[PDB]
Design a protein around this ligand. Structure first.
Ligand code: SO1
Ligand code: GDP
Ligand code: MG
Ligand code: MG
Ligand code: ZN
Lengths: 816, 197, 52, 158
RNA sequence: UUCAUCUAGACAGCCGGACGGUGGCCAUGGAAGUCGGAAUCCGCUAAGGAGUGUGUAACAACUCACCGGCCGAAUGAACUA
């Protein structure tokens, strides 16, 4: 590719059967970027790059895909290897069809290699494997030929094990094999690679033997048996001096001879071998010595681009063949819907259905070009389209826009080319849109077009921190930076905590630190401080108010006698879920509470209000016998209860599961002596006294965390849980795979650094997701400063600036 | 202690003067389960007695005063051997004794009598067992969702012992390189000893 | 990686050892007393901690 | 279509835990719900008793069948009105099994056991019962074992 | 000094077995000898703990008590100063 023309590239997109959309996936330091550079040295975050590959009719015939022509266009997305950026590879898999799995020969199949292979197999993407760093294997480990062959065999075996246990029953023959031509070998850094198909072709051109069976003979236990000219199938001991297999004899032998000669500086033996293998030199390549000479003679003898592109074209699926088995799972809408068939057929003349997945920054803050793939129809610059939100209901109105595209863009290696129109199954960018959809979503022209799938990723935002600007004046800048980061990063999450703190949640420590640097320097641009988030607790009771709490008014004319009770957890959950709601009418809510929750019907009928905020899981029950002016002080009692249940008496947190039974009140006859200013302080003091007398306790939020890790690493999960007070709930195994699923209750307090500790204990193989589940009562006394709950109460009091000692129940209590 | 040895002596005396024929049987490499199976088969038909060869020699020596005939047993009471006393057809008893041969697992560190060979077949186990094959370099591939050895491999050669990885793979594939049973060293009856054969 | 038999061979010299609790000397696994004079040839020995 | 065997142990009268049955039989073909209901049916007899439920797989079908166990048989022998498992630690396996039922259990055990006599098998089952902590004729099962050893009580040598 | 083992074979050393009822009863999410509470049985035994440790999520797999094969005459333990 010489960047022929925008219109020529448009014609290349028009030829849709001759385009290959693939993602390069590997472990972290396995070679992806260097191999992509070597692929673009003959053809030209994760943005697609374009590659041009010609072909002859002989190899075009050997393609099990509908095709027309001799030219192909490869759209390559180089996914990140790290586990903290697995959402980018998930998006790349959603937007592509094939996968180039780079495996380092020294390290073999690693944890992130298995992760990306599992993601591709779950997304129904056909893999092809390239074993990289063969130069490292040949110069560092000094393998002769058989250790190298065995390492290749083991790598292929491990990859095929992953493929067999994680491939869906829709392709079946998606296993990778070097004999089948789906495995290449080479050094991405040195710019050379080869396929045994290429070597079979070279030996057909040099010896005239058949290529079809030499393909399956150049690999495995196939021995040529020289000085006899008989292709034996086993060693047979070679009648002395056991013989070598075809792979080492014919494929590895010339490469190793070149390596040994050049790296041992056999300057007289270099030219003969070079002329024998038909390598030519340049003006200054003649005076090239070892480690610089081999580096070019390998690029000439075995072009890495010429092997990788041929493998991609021959084996990786085109969109017309991949969307056939991927449309059903990429569209929750029924399979008998014209949009579903349109995606299956990849017809460019159907209605437009384009999935935007990424937000590519544009060097202008707030534009964030919409990166994605069109699966059905053709998108046009200046075309009325419907933006659909990630949760857009297609029946009724939702966050759906009726807007128009301003410019269709060709995204390339950091340069955007305006394009007038792009057919289905291609990769493009959009200008003038995406102020309308937060994260992702589909652009449709049909009015009954269901939104596409939500692009679930194996990682989740689990490491949460609080962020606050140092300068209080640029809080709008912080908010804007948070909103722009929450759309630039697909897996980052921003929200408000229960304590009014901006919480940024990320996949892991490294991803969170990268996001925070992006906030501090690019998105927000203002100095901000990052801290562990403060945990919201609840104040509750665990007894029944050992003695009755009594409070007197400031004028001493009104008195309140009451008690505190531990509302049951089921009742609290029903109040929070709306089964027991304040807006529901009494004597029906009372009937529900009596029948389904063991409550007394009289008490449930005598429910005055809920707290806090009028709908919380706290109740006040009027158990008074014969109080006369009770309806007159009901409003003030409700206000005081809302105050007390919003600001509890221990450290000012919301109450939970607290039932305040007003056993008796004494009231002044005149209304002027029992107003709000007399009843509200009296009632809140009485409620505080009853709370502090009913064995005060605090409740903490507990996460429900489910972790997906292999069989070998569940012990690390269990050790981490036992070190951070986790309680295992359930263990399961995915049918057919060694992947377990451990569900456990981890307190939110002991959740900071949990992801890092789990990853260290499991060696990066565990994948946790954590969501708030419930509240757990801390058994320790929250009043003793040396208790487990007392330390957190003291810390909260210090952070809130209140006094050190929690006021005793004697305060708020009047002696009578 | 002495009382227990005296009790063993008494049991030996009763057996040697109540059961007409006896088999001196070697029991090397014979599991306790195998011995239990042998006893269960030989219920009624015979009774098995084991002991320390030295104590057996002492007991027989003491007995000789009354039963000098047993003097031909002493040269054969050596090695890891016990006695099967019987009042039944010699051939039948001998078949019941050496028919319980059991293929023992390929425990590690045990010299391989022959050249153990893993054979190209479809083992039919879950694919997550490929690590054991790779530990020995046995080329494999996934067929019908199960590991299948591609080419035959000499896992252990004759003369050497089994390593831990080799042992694990052999136990996975149920490949026992040896079988163990209660061989018969000697048969004694009518006051005379003779080789089993 | 190291082949398991060679790993066991290396572990025989590097890991399968005793350690004196008083002087930290690396001792034979079946030693009953430390060979060092500084510790008074104490019998207070422990196994060397196993990696993983 | 083979003699494949899984000797898991389930709680009597209840379906077998999916997490405890699926991991091994997921290639074979046995639908976990079918396996569960089959186990429940096979365990109806020993309702509410931990029982070893052996499974044979042929043509994608489970032959749920409760392999007799000493402890399980003893528990069913006391007739064990349905326990509240959640209630408390080791809800006591008290009561009074008798020679007749212990002999019956030993008769069901003889096939697999290696004792010479049914007396020996009864002593075995008696040791199991002693471990369980139940009573025989209000006498310690160890005492009953000693009685068997010393003649006072004689096992029917059938 | 005291108590023990020993030609009916001691100690050490090398090799073999180290089972069956049985995943003994119980919370446990899981606990199969080996996280724990109590229970310390029976069988076959020459002998084998309802288990001395390693190990597993649980298994499994190794190991030791205990008994054997080899050797053949003394040996072991706790103390005392
Ligand atoms: C998937 O995204 C989810 C999950 O990550 C999780 O549910 C997380 O939980 C946030 C918390 C929710 C808790 C309840 C609402 C009551 C108390 C709240 C917490 C503590 O203060 C517990 C978790 C952790 C958060 C504190 C520590 C900041 C919470 C909060 O919002 O304040 O919320 C995000 C949005
Ligand atoms: N010797 C050798 N080194 C390589 C090869 N491929 C990559 N590297 C080295 O790996 C390092 C980083 O690899 P990189 O491609 O950036 O990792 P990735 O793009 O994230 O997968 C570079 O410094 C290279 O020198 C190779 O084929 N041979
Ligand atoms: Mg890279
Ligand atoms: Mg354990
Ligand atoms: Zn020392």
């Amino acid at each position: 590719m010489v960047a022929f023309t925008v219109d020529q590239m448009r014609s290349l997109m028009d030829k849709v059967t001759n385009v290959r959309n693939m993602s390069v996936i590997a472990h972290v330091d396995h070679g992806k970027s260097t191999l992509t550079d070597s692929l673009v040295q003959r053809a030209g975050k994760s943005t697609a790059i374009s590659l041009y590959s010609e072909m002859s009719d002989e190899d075009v015939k050997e393609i099990k895909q509908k095709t027309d022509g001799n030219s192909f266009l490869i759209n390559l997305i180089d996914s990140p290897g790290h586990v903290d950026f697995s959402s980018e590879v998930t998006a790349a898999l959603r937007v592509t069809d094939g996968a180039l799995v780079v495996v380092d020969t020294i390290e073999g199949v690693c944890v992130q290699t298995e992760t990306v292979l599992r993601q591709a197999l779950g997304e129904r993407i056909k893999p092809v494997v390239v074993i990289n760093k063969v130069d490292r294997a040949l110069l560092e480990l000094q393998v002769s030929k058989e250790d190298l062959y065995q390492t290749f065999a083991r790598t292929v075996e491990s990859v095929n094990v992953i493929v067999s246990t994680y491939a869906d029953e829709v392709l079946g023959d998606v296993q990778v094999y070097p004999a089948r031509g789906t495995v290449a070998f080479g050094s991405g850094l040195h710019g050379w690679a080869f396929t045994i198909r290429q070597f079979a072709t070279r030996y057909a051109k040099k010896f005239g033997v058949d290529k079809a069976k030499m393909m399956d003979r150049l690999w495995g236990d196939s021995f040529f048996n020289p000085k006899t000219k008989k292709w034996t199938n086993k060693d047979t001991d070679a009648e002395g001096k056991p013989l070598e297999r075809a792979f080492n004899m014919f494929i590895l032998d010339p490469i190793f001879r070149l390596f040994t000669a050049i790296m041992n500086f056999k300057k007289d033996e270099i030219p003969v071998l070079l002329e024998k293998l038909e390598i030519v030199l340049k003006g200054d390549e003649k005076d090239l010595e070892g480690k610089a000479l081999l580096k070019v003679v390998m690029r000439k003898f075995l072009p890495a681009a010429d092997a990788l592109l041929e493998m991609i074209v021959l084996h990786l699926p085109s969109p017309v063949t991949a969307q056939a088995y991927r449309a059903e799972q990429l569209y929750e809408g029924p399979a008998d819907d014209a949009n579903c068939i349109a995606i299956k057929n990849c017809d460019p003349k159907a209605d437009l259905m384009l999935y935007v997945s990424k937000m590519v920054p544009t060097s202008d803050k707030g534009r964030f070009y919409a990166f994605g793939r069109v699966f059905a129809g053709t998108v046009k610059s200046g075309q009325k389209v419907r933006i659909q939100g990630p949760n857009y209901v297609p029946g009724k109105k939702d966050d759906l826009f009726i807007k128009a595209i301003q410019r269709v863009v060709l995204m390339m290696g950091r340069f955007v080319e305006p394009i007038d129109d792009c057919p289905a199954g291609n990769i493009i960018g959009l200008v003038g849109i995406d102020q309308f959809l937060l994260k992702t979503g589909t652009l449709t022209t049909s009015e009954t077009a269901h939104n596409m799938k939500v692009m679930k990723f194996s990682v989740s935002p689990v490491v949460q921190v609080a962020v606050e600007v140092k300068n209080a004046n640029d809080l709008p800048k912080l908010v804007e930076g948070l909103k722009r980061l929450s759309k630039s990063d697909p897996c980052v999450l921003t929200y408000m905590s229960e304590s009014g703190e901006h919480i940024v949640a990320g996949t892991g420590e490294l991803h969170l630190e990268i996001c925070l640097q992006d906030l501090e320097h690019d998105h927000a641009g203002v100095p901000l401080k990052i801290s562990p988030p403060v945990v919201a607790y609840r104040e509750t009771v665990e007894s029944e108010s050992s003695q009755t709490a009594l409070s007197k008014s400031p004028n001493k004319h009104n008195r309140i006698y009451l008690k505190a009770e531990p509302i049951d957890e089921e009742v609290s959950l029903a109040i929070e879920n709306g089964i027991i709601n304040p807006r529901d009418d009494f004597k029906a809510r009372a009937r529900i509470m009596a029948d389904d929750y063991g409550w007394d019907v009289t008490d449930a009928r005598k429910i005055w209000c809920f707290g806090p905020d009028g709908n919380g899981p706290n109740l006040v029950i009027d158990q008074t016998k014969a109080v006369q002016y009770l309806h007159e002080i009901k409003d003030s009692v409700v206000a005081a209860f809302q105050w007390a249940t919003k600001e509890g008496p221990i450290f000012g947190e919301e109450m939970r599961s607290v039932r305040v039974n007003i056993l008796d009140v004494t009231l002044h006859a005149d209304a002027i002596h029992r107003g709000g200013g007399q009843i509200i302080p009296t009632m809140r003091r009485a409620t505080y006294a009853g709370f502090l007398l009913a064995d005060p306790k605090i409740q903490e939020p507990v996460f429900l965390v489910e972790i997906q890790c292999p069989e070998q690493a569940v012990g690390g999960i269990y050790s981490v849980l036992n070190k951070k007070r986790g309680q295992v709930v359930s263990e399961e195994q995915r049918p057919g795979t060694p992947l377990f699923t451990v569900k456990a209750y981890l307190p939110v307090n002991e959740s900071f650094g949990f992801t890092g500790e789990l990853r260290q204990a499991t060696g990066g193989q565990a994948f946790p997701q954590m969501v708030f589940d419930h509240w757990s009562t801390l058994g320790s006394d929250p009043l003793d400063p040396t208790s487990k709950a007392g330390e957190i109460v003291l810390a909260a009091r210090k952070r809130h600036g209140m006094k050190e000692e929690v006021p005793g129940w004697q305060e708020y209590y009047d002696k009578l | 202690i002495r009382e227990k040895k005296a009790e063993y002596f008494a049991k030996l005396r009763e057996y040697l003067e109540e059961y007409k024929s006896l088999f001196v049987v070697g029991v090397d490499n014979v599991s306790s389960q195998q011995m239990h199976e042998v006893r269960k088969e030989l219920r009624g038909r015979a009774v098995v007695l084991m002991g320390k060869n030295t104590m057996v020699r002492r007991a027989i020596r003491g007995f000789l005063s009354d039963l000098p005939d047993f003097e031909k047993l002493l040269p054969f009471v050596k090695g890891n051997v016990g006695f099967v006393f019987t009042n039944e057809p010699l051939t039948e008893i001998k078949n019941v004794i050496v028919s319980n041969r059991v293929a023992a697992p390929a425990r590690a560190g045990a010299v391989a009598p022959e050249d153990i060979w893993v054979r190209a077949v479809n083992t039919g186990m879950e694919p997550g067992k490929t690590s054991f094959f790779q530990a020995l370099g046995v080329p494999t591939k996934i067929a019908r969702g199960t590991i299948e050895i591609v080419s035959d491999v000499k896992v252990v050669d004759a003369g050497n012992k089994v390593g831990q990885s080799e042992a694990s793979l052999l136990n996975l594939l149920n490949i026992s390189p040896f079988t163990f049973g209660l061989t018969v060293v000697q048969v004694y009856d009518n006051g005379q000893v003779f080789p089993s054969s | 990686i190291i082949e398991p038999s060679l790993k066991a061979l290396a572990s025989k010299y590097n890991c399968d050892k005793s350690v004196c609790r008083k002087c930290y000397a690396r001792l034979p696994p079946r030693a009953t007393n430390c060979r060092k004079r500084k510790c008074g040839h104490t019998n207070q020995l422990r196994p060397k901690k196993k990696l993983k | 279509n083979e003699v494949k065997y899984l000797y898991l142990r389930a709680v009597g009268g209840e379906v077998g835990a999916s997490a405890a049955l699926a991991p091994k039989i997921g290639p074979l073909g046995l639908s976990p719900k079918k396996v569960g209901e089959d186990i429940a049916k096979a365990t109806k007899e020993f309702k509410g008793i931990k029982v070893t439920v052996q499974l044979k797989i042929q043509n994608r079908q489970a032959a749920a069948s409760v392999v007799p166990s000493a402890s399980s048989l003893v528990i069913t022998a006391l007739k064990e009105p349905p326990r509240d498992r959640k209630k408390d630690k080791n809800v006591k396996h008290s009561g009074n099994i008798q020679l007749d039922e212990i002999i019956e259990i030993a008769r069901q055990m003889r096939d697999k056991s290696f004792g010479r006599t049914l007396a020996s098998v009864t002593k075995e089952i008696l040791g199991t019962a002693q471990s369980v902590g139940c009573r025989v004729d209000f006498k310690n099962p160890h005492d009953i074992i000693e009685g068997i050893n010393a003649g006072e009580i004689e096992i029917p040598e059938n």
